[PDB]
Amino acid sequence: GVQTVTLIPGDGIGPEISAAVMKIFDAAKAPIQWEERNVTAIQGPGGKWMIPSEAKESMDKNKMGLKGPLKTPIAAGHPSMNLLLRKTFDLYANVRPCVSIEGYKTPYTDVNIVTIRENTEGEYSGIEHVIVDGVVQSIKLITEGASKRIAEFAFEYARNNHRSNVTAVHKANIMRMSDGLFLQKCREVAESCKDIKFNEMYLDTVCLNMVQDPSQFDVLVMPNLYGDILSDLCAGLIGGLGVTPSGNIGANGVAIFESVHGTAPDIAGKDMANPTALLLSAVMMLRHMGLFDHAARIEAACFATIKDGKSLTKDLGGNAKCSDFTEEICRRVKDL
Amino acid sequence: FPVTMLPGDGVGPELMHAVKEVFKAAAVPVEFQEHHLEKLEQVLSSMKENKVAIIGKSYDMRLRRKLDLFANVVHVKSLPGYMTRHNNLDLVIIREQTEGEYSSLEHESARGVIECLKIVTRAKSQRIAKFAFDYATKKGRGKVTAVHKANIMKLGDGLFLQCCEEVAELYPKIKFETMIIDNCCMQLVQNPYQFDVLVMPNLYGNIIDNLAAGLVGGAGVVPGESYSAEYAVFETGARHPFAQAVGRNIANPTAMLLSASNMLRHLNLEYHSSMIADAVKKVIKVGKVRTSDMGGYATCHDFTEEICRRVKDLDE
Ligand SMILES: [Ca+2]
């Protein structure tokens, strides 16, 4: 009947753009009800290692979550806010589709990349050691179970979203044991799903290739660090972090779709924020939930409002206010 | 006069062939001691005597080890005729070349739990930040940006970024910025013109070298250099596995000849350096002969032959 989504508006422009997403959803009469929570880490017993229980509990019930931009904490020992969110819900896959927006003139047209990044291991592991004076050691660890899990996820995502190819990105010529095991677990999944065409490329080669001719890529799966940087590279191909959606799949059917751009508080509260990032993420969310007919319209109207050009926000080069932008999309979906 | 020549893998021997031909055409007064591919000692002593080499492509890094080629310089600079989605670009990528995850420190701590060590030390961190600022002034560059992921790798990159900020104060004439790698990568493809001189650790230099090279025209045209405290070896800038090992008489010599000109400018035969450089850049601009990688239909010696025709005509 009606689905309740956990909604984390966050900081800065976040509550502005999340009201836009709510109103636009209401405009399209989407069976979505919102449950507003905040996730700013509270100081746990003797430290700071936990998010609010009401947040945990709400996301465990609702399974779906929409997250705006979060302020970078300034507390002394405070950890990364997405780190905590990653550990408490075991968000192991970070999906980032990059498709050129027809109404946004960029030097790259006709790009349709999905980067599947492993979010739990890799160079982004907690382990770092001072070995002796002025000599620091950082631990990258690859496990078989985590690799197979992300590999398995990448192929499943190609199946459900009708993508023809999976490409495994690695540097196994340098890190032959660690990345090698990522490659070989990717290969094992690949042999099980021969309906998906599978290849392997080297990270460095991909970046060179991506910048020249991005039309040659479909889905790309890779260990943590490579994903973190190559996902921002492809973003820069279509417009930047203002227009890229991003989801995070975790354990127990928990998924948190998020905007990845800054909290940008220099325009905060001035009705000038561009909410298309969050909204496109909310489309992924609606697609993840099976509301394809609601997603198709909402996504279709946002694409239109941009191709039109009348209503555009300062950041995309236009002069209009968020409120105007949000209203055109609302008025555009109602007749749909 | 004497230069050590390592032809290397794949088309390396073919590429270096073109360099010798151009040098004969330009009457360049350098004799190359070809060493083909333990064996490193012979090369090492050649370097100790010559102090300058040109090379193609724990594999070869043990060479970098031995000759302490700690700094890698890559010039990304759009060529006037060769048109790309990013024109009029001019950056230089300084990359520390010996540390990081490149020493093959890897083990199994449990079944299917591989652990991989990344090392970074204060010695080499400083050494490249100093080198970077030296470079920037000695070439007139405005600012240098230090690329890092110090919000995640707090100890390692943090130690790198710290040394950078320590050297940045002894060079007040040059602006100093810091940028996080995943952002710095996005920025290079939206607007690369905000950058001047980049300095990074080993792995990030592998990413940005090849990403930057694509901005300017690809592995076929982007040159590079690696410096020691005494030696200077000249090579290509984009060194990804499939850089140009694919083909025969198809490869684009543009990258090595421009690297060979840079080598001559290091040898202070700044005459031939500027001649060969100009010969290469104009042949490209006129746009008659262009190899396949540049969207033309031209064999490698076709390009090389016309380059010499132009360079011999400049001589007379
Ligand atoms: Ca990122």
Numbering used by the authors:
A (entry chain A): 3 to 338
B (entry chain B): 15 to 51, 61 to 80, 93 to 351
What do the paper's sentences say?
Crystals of the αβ heterodimer with the α subunit bound with a Ca2+ at the active site (αCaβ) grew at condition II and belong to space group I4, and the structure was determined at 3.0 Å resolution with each asymmetric unit containing two αCaβ molecules, which form a dimer of heterodimers via the clasp domains. In this structure, there is evident electron density at the active site, which is interpreted as a Ca2+ due to the presence of 0.2 m Ca2+ in the crystallization solution and a reasonable B factor after structure refinement. We also obtained crystals of the αCaβ heterodimer at condition II in the presence of CIT or/and ADP (both 50 mm); however, in these structures, there is only a Ca2+ bound at the active site and no CIT or ADP bound in either the α or β subunit. Structural analysis shows that in the αCaβ structure, the N-terminal region of helix α7 in both the α and β subunits assumes the active α-helical conformation, and the key residues Tyr-126A and Lys-142A at the active site and Tyr-137B and Lys-153B at the pseudo-allosteric site (equivalent to Tyr-135G and Lys-151G at the allosteric site) also assume active conformations similar to those in the αMgγMg+CIT+ADP heterodimer. In other words, the αCaβ structure exhibits an active overall conformation. In the αCaβ structure, the longer side chain of Gln-132B pushes the side chain of Tyr-137B away to adopt the active conformation, which is stabilized by a hydrogen bond with the side chain of Lys-173A. This hydrogen-bonding interaction also induces the β5B-β6B loop to assume the active conformation, which further triggers the conformational changes of the structure elements at the heterodimer interface and the active site, including the N-terminal region of helix α7 in both the α and β subunits and the β5A-β6A loop at the active site.
